């Protein structure tokens, strides 16, 4: 598994941290070993950063989006300009059928009169 | 101040002294970034009469709530708009003489989901580069019997049945 | 009264938590046990399920119709310097001796520094032209976004 | 038989069409920019970038599936087309 081990690192590390998250929540369902107590608090805004940054979600990640859409589009536009062509000439001279999932033809003079089995 | 929850303030000078009042004393020695200088607890402390003056004058005063003997000791604020009216602002607790502001249950969720989302996004963006597609080849990554065994098999059986292995 | 709905929301969120954790563990084990012939479809599918449902479910089970979690004062009772069966069956084979290394590991709040630098560049990108274009561009983009969705949804009748 | 294969083709076509349309509608669903509340800005920003990335990937996969369907239709018609076969035979 020498390839995809780096993704494996990032995911097992994210796995251990979210295991620590299920751990803190496992102590959050707890009233033994630890008590809950609610009192609120405040956090003044610096800006209207949800919107502002969301617009960057469009800039940044819709640029990644549009990039990948245009990248698929350039790959395909290149790709279109060979199997299915050859099948035409073959089907034009010889005799073919499809049974199961493969493609099978005949050689025998059998539709033309012979009975040689 | 902006992210004081991660900052740790320690001082080995007052480690040997540790009792009920030593928690309040160590928290309020001098110039603690966690301990506000202009707090009303000073006004009670320097002169005398550390018993009742916390509830008398207007201010935010520090009282313990839970105290387990070896290490952990909890410090609570009360903003005193009126006597017998308790509202807290921030949460403190010391473990082995190390002061910590107790976080909420919201911002810790924020930090953990931030780390998780960053890790998963990084893994996905790294995994994007490996796949290549072509309409003819498909997807990939960069990095017979002549029906006479119905006889030869019988001979082998007749051979095995007549010549057992000697091991 | 707040405590009852707090506990119900608690159990809902931990149910979706257990779902997400099983998702991640199953994805890792499937990657390993099935490194036979794996393909880009199945992994894009796995990511989509992980993203779409777990993300949107937890996000709406948090920020609507809830007692407020950003209240809670977090104050454990004691230190348990020894191996309790409470831990090993409460947590399914984890949680070593609860101590002064895992008191902050539990109660850590400072994130990694890369997002801190990101916030520094958030201050930087707020240092550009503002207070006349933030709200103005919210208005414009909101309006034309809404017009777009209206037009595209309108014609399927 | 032959009814099952053709109805499978119909199912694949309608599934992929509704999938791409639904994906674009959800892209415009998350496209409304609003004010935040208790959502921890950077987290949902990063994961919405992640969601639009995986949704663009879904769009590309939908296009590739349509290409595969077109190729299969091309194979099917040539092989079983009685009228086309006859013309070649008579020439």
Swiss-Prot record, chain A:
Subcellular location as annotated: Nucleus
Protein name in UniProt: Mediator of RNA polymerase II transcription subunit 17
UniProt disease annotation: Microcephaly, postnatal progressive, with seizures and brain atrophy: A disorder characterized by postnatal progressive microcephaly and severe developmental retardation associated with cerebral and cerebellar atrophy. Infants manifest swallowing difficulties leading to failure to thrive, jitteriness, poor visual fixation, truncal arching, seizures. There is no acquisition of developmental milestones and patients suffer from marked spasticity and profound retardation. Progressive microcephaly becomes evident few months after birth.
Role: Component of the Mediator complex, a coactivator involved in the regulated transcription of nearly all RNA polymerase II-dependent genes. Mediator functions as a bridge to convey information from gene-specific regulatory proteins to the basal RNA polymerase II transcription machinery. Mediator is recruited to promoters by direct interactions with regulatory proteins and serves as a scaffold for the assembly of a functional preinitiation complex with RNA polymerase II and the general transcription factors.
Family, as annotated: Belongs to the Mediator complex subunit 17 family.
Tissue/organ expression: Ubiquitous.
Originating species: Homo sapiens (Human)
Gene label: MED17
UniProtKB/Swiss-Prot annotation, chain B:
Annotated localization: Nucleus
GO MF annotation list: DNA binding; transcription coactivator activity; transcription coactivator binding; ubiquitin protein ligase activity
Keywords, in A-Z order: Acetylation, Activator, Isopeptide bond, Nucleus, Transcription, Transcription regulation, Ubl conjugation
UniProt GO BP: positive regulation of transcription by RNA polymerase II; positive regulation of transcription elongation by RNA polymerase II; positive regulation of transcription initiation by RNA polymerase II; protein ubiquitination; regulation of transcription by RNA polymerase II; RNA polymerase II preinitiation complex assembly; somatic stem cell population maintenance
GO CC, alphabetical: core mediator complex; mediator complex; membrane; nucleoplasm; nucleus; ubiquitin ligase complex
tRNA-binding keyword on record: no
This protein's record includes keyword DNA-binding: no
Subunit composition and interactions: Component of the Mediator complex, which is composed of MED1, MED4, MED6, MED7, MED8, MED9, MED10, MED11, MED12, MED13, MED13L, MED14, MED15, MED16, MED17, MED18, MED19, MED20, MED21, MED22, MED23, MED24, MED25, MED26, MED27, MED29, MED30, MED31, CCNC, CDK8 and CDC2L6/CDK11. The MED12, MED13, CCNC and CDK8 subunits form a distinct module termed the CDK8 module. Mediator containing the CDK8 module is less active than Mediator lacking this module in supporting transcriptional activation.
Family membership noted in the UniProt record: Belongs to the Mediator complex subunit 6 family.
Organism: Homo sapiens
Record gene name: MED6
Swiss-Prot record, chain C:
Protein name: Mediator of RNA polymerase II transcription subunit 8
Residues shown, of full length: 3 to 159 of 268
Its job: Component of the Mediator complex, a coactivator involved in the regulated transcription of nearly all RNA polymerase II-dependent genes. Mediator functions as a bridge to convey information from gene-specific regulatory proteins to the basal RNA polymerase II transcription machinery. Mediator is recruited to promoters by direct interactions with regulatory proteins and serves as a scaffold for the assembly of a functional preinitiation complex with RNA polymerase II and the general transcription factors.
Signal sequence annotation: none
Family: Belongs to the Mediator complex subunit 8 family.
GO cellular component, one term: nucleoplasm
Free-text comment about domains: The elongin BC complex binding domain is also known as BC-box with the consensus [APST]-L-x(3)-C-x(3)-[AILV].
Residue(s) carrying Phosphoserine: 80
Annotated keywords: Activator, Coiled coil, Nucleus, Phosphoprotein, Transcription, Transcription regulation, Ubl conjugation pathway
UniProtKB/Swiss-Prot annotation, chain D:
Designated name of the protein: Mediator of RNA polymerase II transcription subunit 22
Record's subcellular location: Nucleus
Subunit structure: Component of the Mediator complex, which is composed of MED1, MED4, MED6, MED7, MED8, MED9, MED10, MED11, MED12, MED13, MED13L, MED14, MED15, MED16, MED17, MED18, MED19, MED20, MED21, MED22, MED23, MED24, MED25, MED26, MED27, MED29, MED30, MED31, CCNC, CDK8 and CDC2L6/CDK11. The MED12, MED13, CCNC and CDK8 subunits form a distinct module termed the CDK8 module. Mediator containing the CDK8 module is less active than Mediator lacking this module in supporting transcriptional activation.
Organism phylogeny: Eukaryota, Metazoa, Chordata, Craniata, Vertebrata
Superkingdom of the source species: Eukaryota
Family indicated by similarity: Belongs to the Mediator complex subunit 22 family.
Source organism per UniProt: Homo sapiens (Human)
Membrane-spanning intervals of the chain: none
Reported function: Component of the Mediator complex, a coactivator involved in the regulated transcription of nearly all RNA polymerase II-dependent genes. Mediator functions as a bridge to convey information from gene-specific regulatory proteins to the basal RNA polymerase II transcription machinery. Mediator is recruited to promoters by direct interactions with regulatory proteins and serves as a scaffold for the assembly of a functional preinitiation complex with RNA polymerase II and the general transcription factors.
């Amino acid at each position: 598994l020498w390839p995809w081990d780096s993704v494996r690192n990032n995911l097992r590390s994210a796995l251990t941290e979210m295991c620590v998250l299920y751990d803190v929540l496992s102590i959050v369902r707890d009233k033994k070993f630890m008590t809950l107590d609610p009192v609120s608090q405040d956090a003044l805004p610096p800006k209207q950063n949800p919107q502002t940054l969301q617009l960057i979600s469009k800039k940044k990640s819709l640029a990644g989006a549009a990039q990948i859409l245009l990248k698929g589009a350039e790959r395909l536009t290149k790709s279109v300009t060979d199997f299915n062509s050859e099948l035409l000439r073959l089907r034009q001279h010889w005799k073919l059928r499809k049974v199961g999932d493969k493609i099978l033809g005949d050689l025998s003079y059998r539709s033309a009169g012979s009975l040689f089995p | 101040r902006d992210n004081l929850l991660g900052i740790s303030w320690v001082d080995s000078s007052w480690i040997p002294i540790l009792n009920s009042g030593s928690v309040l004393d160590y928290f309020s020695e001098r110039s603690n970034p966690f301990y506000d200088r202009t707090c009303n607890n000073e006004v009670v402390k320097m002169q005398r009469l550390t018993l009742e003056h916390l509830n008398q004058m207007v201010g935010i005063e520090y009282i313990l709530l839970h105290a387990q003997e070896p290490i952990l000791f909890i410090i609570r604020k009360q903003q005193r708009q009126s006597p017998a009216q308790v509202i807290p602002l921030a949460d403190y607790y010391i473990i082995a003489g190390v002061i910590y502001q107790a976080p909420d249950l919201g911002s810790v969720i924020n930090s953990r989901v931030l780390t998780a989302v960053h890790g998963i996004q990084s893994a996905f963006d790294e995994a994007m580069s490996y796949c290549r597609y072509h309409p003819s080849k498909g997807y990939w990554w960069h990095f017979s019997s002549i029906f006479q065994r119905q006889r030869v098999d019988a001979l082998l059986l007749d051979l095995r049945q007549k010549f057992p292995p000697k091991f | 009264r707040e405590e009852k709905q707090l506990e119900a929301s608690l159990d809902a969120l931990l149910s979706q938590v257990a779902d997400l954790k099983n998702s991640l563990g199953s994805f890792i084990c499937k990657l390993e046990n099935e490194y036979g012939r794996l393909t880009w479809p199945s992994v894009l599918d796995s990511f989509a399920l992980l993203s779409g449902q777990l993300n949107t479910l937890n996000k709406v089970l948090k920020h609507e119709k809830t007692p407020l979690f950003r209240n809670q004062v977090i104050i454990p009772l004691v230190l348990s310097p020894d191996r309790d069966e409470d831990l090993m069956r409460q947590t399914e084979g984890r949680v070593p001796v609860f101590s002064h290394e895992v008191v902050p590991d539990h109660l850590r709040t400072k994130p990694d520094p890369e997002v801190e630098e990101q916030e520094k560049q958030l201050t930087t990108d707020a240092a550009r032209i503002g207070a006349d274009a933030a709200q103005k561009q919210i208005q414009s983009l909101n309006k034309m976004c809404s017009n777009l969705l209206e037009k595209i949804s309108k014609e399927e009748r | 038989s032959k009814e099952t294969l053709l109805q499978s083709y119909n199912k694949r076509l309608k599934d992929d069409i509704k999938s791409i349309m639904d994906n674009f509608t959800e892209i415009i669903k998350t496209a409304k920019i609003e004010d935040e509340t208790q959502v921890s800005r950077a987290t949902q920003g990063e994961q919405d970038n992640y969601e639009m990335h995986v949704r663009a990937a879904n769009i590309v996969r939908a296009g590739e599936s349509l290409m595969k369907l077109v190729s299969d239709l091309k194979q099917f018609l040539i092989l079983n087309d009685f009228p086309s076969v006859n013309e070649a035979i008579d020439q």
